[PDB]
């Protein structure tokens, strides 16, 4: 049995394209693995705080309740990530970057000695053995163009903490009409079917 962790980050709630893709992933995964446990963390519904001077200080004198709470949340998020086998991440493109909702999550899980460390061989990620799937929706078409810096960035960040097995699924041209959008979702769903079947 595998445990699947789904991280939603869209700020569009019910109208989220990436959220619709994560729902499809969950639907298909539950159908294939009826015993698998799925945990969903909606980073928009339940926001993670912005990494500021006070919080970064906490992650490395007495701590204020705010700092204590943020540290506890960081621990929770990290423990949750390490406890699951399949990590599904919704990462749509907002102003050429990922949603701040997801960025805040990354800023709290990237911690020296906890999710990565340095050895005789150099930097080594500590979140091992995971299978990750990135579901990224975009209004325009950026894949394989100089304007898509989020896919490369996600690969680098995830790799740094140890998640190197990352499948990227894209749904682009969403803002170019119901036809283009519909075909984008269909090809993304086909991509998800492949991941689920793998």
Ligand X SMILES: Cc1cc2nc3c(=O)[nH]c(=O)nc-3n(C[C@H](O)[C@H](O)[C@H](O)COP(=O)(O)O)c2cc1C
Phi, psi of 97 (to 5 degrees): -130, 180
Query: C-beta of 94: minimal distance to ligand X in Å?
Result: 4
The encoded tokens of residue 122 equal 């150099």
Indicate whether 115 belongs to the interface with ligand X (CB under 6 A): no
Indicate whether 176 belongs to the interface with ligand X (CB under 6 A): no
Indicate whether 50 belongs to the interface with a second copy (CB under 8 A): yes
d(CA 55, CA 175): 37
Query: Dihedral sign, CA of 103, 96, 25, 195?
Result: negative
Which residues are CB-neighbours of 146 under 8 A, at least 6 positions away?
none
Residue 142 labeled ligand binder: yes
Query: C-beta of 1: minimal distance to ligand X in Å?
Result: 29
Indicate whether 137 belongs to the interface with ligand X (CB under 6 A): yes
The site string for ligand X over 5-44 (x = CB under 6 A, - otherwise) reads -----x-x---xxxx-------------------------
Task: Specify the DSSP element, H or E, that contains 124.
Answer: strand 122-125
SS3 75: helix
> In 3-state terms, the chain is what percent helix, strand and coil (to 5)?
45, 20, 35
Indicate whether 18 belongs to the interface with a second copy (CB under 8 A): no
Part of the chain binding a second copy (CB under 8 A), chosen from 52-60, 77-85, 164-172, 180-188 = 52-60
| Interacting residues toward a second copy by CB under 8 A | 11-13, 44, 47, 50-53, 56, 94-98, 100-101, 103-104, 106-107, 110, 146-147, 149, 152-153, 156-157, 160
């Amino acid at each position: 049995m595998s445990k699947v962790l789904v991280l939603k980050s869209s700020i569009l709630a019910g109208y989220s394209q990436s959220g619709q893709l994560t729902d499809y992933f969950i639907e298909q995964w539950r159908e294939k693995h009826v015993a698998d446990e799925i945990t969903v963390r909606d980073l928009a519904a339940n926001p993670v705080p912005v990494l500021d001077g006070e919080l970064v200080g906490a992650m490395r004198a007495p701590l204020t309740p705010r700092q204590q709470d943020a540290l506890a949340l960081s621990d929770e998020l990290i423990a949750e990530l390490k406890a699951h086998d399949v990590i599904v991440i919704a990462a749509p493109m907002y102003n050429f970057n990922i949603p701040t909702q997801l960025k805040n999550y990354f800023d709290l899980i990237a911690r020296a000695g906890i999710t990565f460390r340095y050895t005789e061989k150099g930097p080594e990620g500590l979140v091992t053995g995971k299978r990750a799937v990135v579901l990224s929706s975009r209004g325009g078409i950026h894949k394989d163009t100089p304007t898509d810096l989020i896919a490369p960035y996600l690969k680098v960040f995830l790799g740094f903490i140890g998640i190197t097995d990352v499948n990227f699924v894209f749904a682009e041209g969403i803002a170019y009409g119901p036809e283009v959008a519909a075909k984008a979702q269909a090809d993304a769903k086909a991509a998800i079917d492949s991941v689920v079947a793998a």
